[PDB]
Structure formats: structure tokens, C-alpha cells
Structure 1
Amino acid sequence: PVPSRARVYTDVNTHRPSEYWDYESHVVEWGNQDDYQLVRKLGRGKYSEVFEAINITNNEKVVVKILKPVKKKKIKREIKILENLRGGPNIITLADIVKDPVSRTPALVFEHVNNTDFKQLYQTLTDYDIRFYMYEILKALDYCHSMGIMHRDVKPHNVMIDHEHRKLRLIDWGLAEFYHPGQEYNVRVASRYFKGPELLVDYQMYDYSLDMWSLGCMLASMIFRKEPFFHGHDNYDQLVRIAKVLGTEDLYDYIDKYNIELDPRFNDILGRHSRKRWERFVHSENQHLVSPEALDFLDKLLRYDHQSRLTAREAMEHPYFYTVVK
């Protein structure tokens, strides 16, 4: 395959001191674990467990994430990314790092986020709230991309919103990575329904624009009230579901452009499909969420060619957000 490079924030990391991105060399500053009282486990992932907790020194509600004793490399990567992004718009705030006595591993403490006030993005929102919260997610993505970081796991479960106060956080930076031009990355990132075509066709030289495809998948599910929008039964069927919408000729042009050697299974299952107009997904019960601006925006995110997709900053300038107070 031919190389690719991000068209924005291309060499951010190249120009930084090595300490910025060389997470393996990072030295952890430890707090005191007994400042935190675990209240209940909220969830369990492949690499962590998350808990509702209280900082008993000040009665503050916090979220604690105990990192499973997997590859230490991944632990330092998440910590370094969270410290580099700390204070950025809508980025979850890492307040402390303590050693859990039971797991014997680092436990990350997050402040200004709690399970009572903030909830995962599982709500059915109005047109205005979709635009408002999508703009808040874009502020987080433009910030992390501008800091040379790709999130690689954008999905509803990684967006926390306090609806009463209209606050949002982009969470779970466990799959995030530093972008370096020319670097090959693992394609086993993101949840199936949110995987970009680059991951499905095994193109490793991807970049920040992967997060923009995932965002487009979220948007399409919200405006069309179809969860998930691209509902593949496995990774092979996931690309067929995308191709039934966007067509196979632009997919094959994308594969041709980057000289991707396609898995032969895809040539057997893809067949030939033409692009559908978005109005094919509009019906009486979602038409109130659809506008010409929403369709144009969706169209500019959901493009096979990762270099052609809107970037997070270009998305912030799009007409879909003109109505959002900024």
C-alpha cells in the first residue's frame, strides 16, 4: 500500500520534545488511595473496571478506573495522554493516580464527572440538542487532534453528559494514541458499528480522521433514529452494510487510491451497489431531525477516503452548527 498522512496536525508530535509522546519513559506521580472511598462498580471492560467513588477529604463525587494488570505500555499511554490533554475543552479531567490495594495496579481518579450528574449518551435528543452536543464533542476532538492524539473509540458509551447543566465529557482514552506521520497502527480499535472503512479493509496508516467517521456513525443513528446506523453482524458484514449505503464504486476507488490489498472475502460479498440518497432513511418519525444542513454534514463525514472527510475543525464551521450559539 501507498502511504497516507493526516492533512491537519500532521507533524505535531514530530516537533515536540520526545517526552511528550514517549509514554514508555513517563514517571507516574502517585496520590493516596485512602482519600477515595469506592461506592460501587459501574462497569467492567477488557482492560479496566470503573467505579462511582467519593473523595472523603472533601465530599466530592469522582469516578475511579482501575486498570487491569495487562501490558504496562498501554497503562502509561493512557496516563500520558490524559495528562497532556488535561484542561482541554470537554476532555475528562484526570485528578489523581493511586495504587489500588486489591488489583495492585494504577487507579485513575477523574474529577468534574460523576455517575449521578453525568450519564452516557443513551438519551433520545431533540434536533437542537443533537447539534449542541455534537458541537461539544467536536471541541474535544479538535483539541485532542491538535495535541497530536487520536481517540480511536468514539461511540455513545464514551460520551458523558450532564443534561441539566449542559456539560459534556469525552471519556475512555484507553485506546487513544499519538499520531506520527507514516506510522502503522493496529486496526483492532473502535467498536464494530463505529469502525471506519480503513480499519475494515486493514489499512494501517490511518489518522485523526478515523474519529470523524465514528462521529458520523453516531450522528446518522441519532438523526435517522436507527441504532446502530451500520448494523454489521461481523467485520465483513459491517463493510457490506456501509457499501449498501455509500456504494461499492467509491469503496473500490478508495482501495485503488491507497493500493490496499483487499481481503478476497470482500470481493465475494460486496457485489455492486450504488450510493443511496439520504432521504431513503427519512420517514415520518425522524423527518423533524433532518435538514439539508444535517444531510450535507453527514455526507462530508461519511466518506470512504479518510483524507476527504471533514476534519473536526472544518466540521465546527459547517452550516449544521450555524444555529448553535457559539
Structure 2
Amino acid sequence: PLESQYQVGPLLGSGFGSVYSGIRVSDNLPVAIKHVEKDRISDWGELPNGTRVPMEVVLLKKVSSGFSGVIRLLDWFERPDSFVLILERPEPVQDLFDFITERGALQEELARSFFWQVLEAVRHCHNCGVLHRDIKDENILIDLNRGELKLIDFGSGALLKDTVYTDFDGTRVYSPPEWIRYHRYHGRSAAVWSLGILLYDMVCGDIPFEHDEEIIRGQVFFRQRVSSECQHLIRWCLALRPSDRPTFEEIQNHPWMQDVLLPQETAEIHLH
């Protein structure tokens, strides 16, 4: 019933598998259709009702309930050598990496709005028991009309727990120093680090650290003009000691995070 209920369109991307544009024939709902080969899945779990699935599906199902800044799983399918996921697809949309590539460093007011919606989405995941572990500009989509951000690739994710993680499959340049040095981290505080990398990316147009030695050394240089407030939040998230990082709450009460724009106003001003 998969080949019948969706009409396939162009390839959107690959790297996590291959994702195509698609339409639900049922009712013209735009969708993204994502194929993952069994052979390349390292990491499996089980749905409450109990079959053996890719962790990504466990995670997506735990966070796709209700609204939020996560692209929702609408349906999934097993095939003999692959799994296939059907996801929301906002229309039109651009990923943040390509947005930043095209437009360079974001004005603060726009970064503040975007970063805020990222925090709301990640709180939402942490709440649903899910840790993303690969937060970064290419895992974030922009619905250009509504100004709403949406998180996407759960393939390196995990169940959130309070004990140490000794595996990491995400992106190195976004990984915290404790992972580089000890091969251990905790979820929240690792995620905060990656948030601080992301915020630097948004306001400087590029990631701050490229090599292991710079991650570990953790000194941040600004190549672009950034308010003292923005710089201080960033250095805070990128503190070397995990316990010196802010919690989500403290990131959202920081002075740089005041007077955020709603998504709609953000798009009027900045995206049309």
C-alpha cells in the first residue's frame, strides 16, 4: 500500500538515507519520503506495541504527538531491505545551512527568533524523553512563509537518560570537549554545547571550531560584529566544564533572549 498511497517526486537530499518529495494521494498533503537501508541502521529499539524498528521511528513517534518544532512522522513502512518514513513537509522550506550559506551571518533579531524556536523544540524533545544528539544548521528547516523552524534528523538520537553516554554518532565539530577528551558526556549539557555552536554559526556565518584541539581549548573568536550580550551567552554555552553551562531555562532567561519575535512577524520582516 505504500506505492499507491503516495506519489513520489524529486529527490530532496541524501547522505541518513534518501529523502524525496511526495504527495499523499489520499488528500494532496505534501510529505517527505525517506528511505533507510536496513544494512546501514546501527541502532534499533521497539515500539510500545512491540516490533523491532529503527531507533529513529521510536524517537519520532515519541515526539510527533501534538504540535511543536519537530517534523512529524505521519506513517512508516517496512520493506525487505529498507524502512520508509513518511514525514510532514512544509512548503516552501529551506534548511538553515543553505539559508546561512546564501545570506551570511544573520542579524541578531533574526538569530534570536530562530534560536528561541530551536530551544522550544529541543525542550519539547527532552520532555518527550528524546535526545536528538545532532542539533546543527542542516538539521533545521525553515518554513519560509510562517517563519517556523522544524528539527529533522533523529537518526543519531537516543532516549534521554540521566547517566553518561559513551557512544556518539553525530557531528564532530558540534561535539563537546568531554566527548573529544574522555569519550563520555551527559545529554543536556552536551546538547547545550551544540546549541552554543549553533548560535555562533547563526551570528557569525560559520562554526567556531574546526579541529579537535580548538574544541578542547574552547576559546571563541568572533570574526563578525556581535553584541556583548550575544557573545556572553555563547561563551556560556560553550563552557569547557559541562556543569558551568546554562540549563535551557537559564538560556531562555538570558538578557540576549528577551523580546523575541513571534514566527509570523519574523517572516514578514526577514523572510518576505
Q: Give the TM-score taking structure 1 as reference length.
A: 0.69
Residue in 1 that maps onto 2:184: 204
Residue in 2 that maps onto 1:178: 159
Contact 1:54–1:60, Cα closer than 8 Å, also in 2: yes
Residue in 2 that maps onto 1:195: 175
Matches within 5 A, 1:268-283: 281-282=222-223
1:179-213, Cα deviation, whole Å (9 max, x unpaired): 223354313x2212211112211332422221211
Residue in 2 that maps onto 1:80: 58
Aligned residues: 246
Matches within 5 A, 1:144-159: 144-159=125-140
Over the residues paired in the alignment, what is the CA RMSD in angstroms?
A: 2.2
Question: Aligned equivalents of 1:196 and 1:88: distance in 2?
Answer: 30
Matches within 5 A, 1:188-267: 189-225=169-205, 227-232=206-211, 238=212, 240-246=213-219
Pairwise CA distance, 1:106: 2.1
Tell me the amino acid that sits aligned with residue 30 of structure 2.
K
Contact 1:88–1:140, Cα closer than 8 Å, also in 2: no
Residue in 2 that maps onto 1:66: 35
Larger strand proportion of the pair: 2
Contact 1:297–1:320, Cα closer than 8 Å, also in 2: yes
Contact 2:107–2:203, Cα closer than 8 Å, also in 1: no
Pairwise CA distance, 1:88: 4.7
Relative to structure 1, is the Cα distance of residues 147 and 307 closer, same or farther in structure 2, using a 3 angstrom cutoff?
farther
Tell me the amino acid that sits aligned with residue 231 of structure 1.
E
Pairwise CA distance, 1:138: 0.2
Q: Give the TM-score taking structure 2 as reference length.
A: 0.82
Matches within 5 A, 1:4-83: 32-45=2-15, 47-70=16-39, 71=41, 73=44, 75-83=53-61
Tell me the amino acid that sits aligned with residue 190 of structure 1.
G
Q: Residue 208 of structure 1: SS of its match in structure 2?
A: helix
Contact 2:17–2:35, Cα closer than 8 Å, also in 1: yes
Question: Aligned equivalents of 2:182 and 2:7: distance in 1?
Answer: 43
Tell me the amino acid that sits aligned with residue 98 of structure 1.
F
Runs of 4+ in structure 1 deviating by more than 4 angstroms, as ranges, are: none
Q: Residue 307 of structure 1: SS of its match in structure 2?
A: helix
Aligned sequence identity (%): 25
